[PDB]
Amino acid sequence: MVLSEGEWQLVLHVWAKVEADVAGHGQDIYIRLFKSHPETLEKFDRFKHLKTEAEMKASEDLKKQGVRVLTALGAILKKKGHHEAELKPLAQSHATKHKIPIKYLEFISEAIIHVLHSRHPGNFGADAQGAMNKALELFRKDIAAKYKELGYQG
Ligand code: HEM
Ligand SMILES: [O-]
């Protein structure tokens, strides 16, 4: 699959708004993921004890993690599909160290789309959401191919 340049520009225009406060966006995305799909929280040995949204919001380590995730994803999106180098280390850690199924990558993709739809209606109308879904689907398709190369079913 391949995105057009116009689609990439819709992705990068909303990502520029995320970058006004990457930490706050990361907190919202993790809270949405863990509330919608609680099983995903069990994969985090440092955070699986958190019981409420208040505790998640107050966790400085979770905030730092959210900044790491969104900055890594942002660097992948800015490559506009030419992300082989960035996906190598990420696929290896997520397949072998963290053991994150493709289904859970689908869940965090849904959390990202929900938070952008809520915060950024000015840059996340239907065409922009479609472009972001295509970019995240491309990311998951290429991660899934690397998972298989690495020996992990996904
Ligand atoms: C957009 C998708 C994702 C991106 C870009 C991403 C990125 C990252 C990065 C950059 C790190 C730190 C370096 C590393 O270990 O590779 C990390 C750590 C981690 N990721 Fe992900 N991740 C994603 C999705 C997920 C999902 C869906 C889960 C689990 C449901 C997950 C579980 C973990 C865990 C458990 C760690 C280690 C956390 C810690 O140090 O406490 N990741 N991720
Ligand atoms: O993560």
Ligand 1 pocket test target in 94, 104, 106, 110 with most atoms within 8 Å of CB: 94
Say which amino acid occupies 126: A
| Closest-approaching ligand to the CA atom of 71 | 1
CA distance 92 to 99: 9
Look up residue 93 and give its DSSP letter. I
Residue 25 tokens, joined: 């966006």
**What Å resolution does this PDB entry report?**
1.8
**CB contact at 8 A, 127 and 10:** yes
- Are 132 and 11 in contact by the 8 Å Cβ rule? The answer is yes
Domain with 134 in it: 1-154
Question: How much distance in Å is there from the Cα of 4 to the middle of ligand 1?
Answer: 28
Q: What is the CATH number of the domain that holds 12?
A: 1.10.490.10
Question: What approach was used to elucidate this structure?
Answer: X-ray
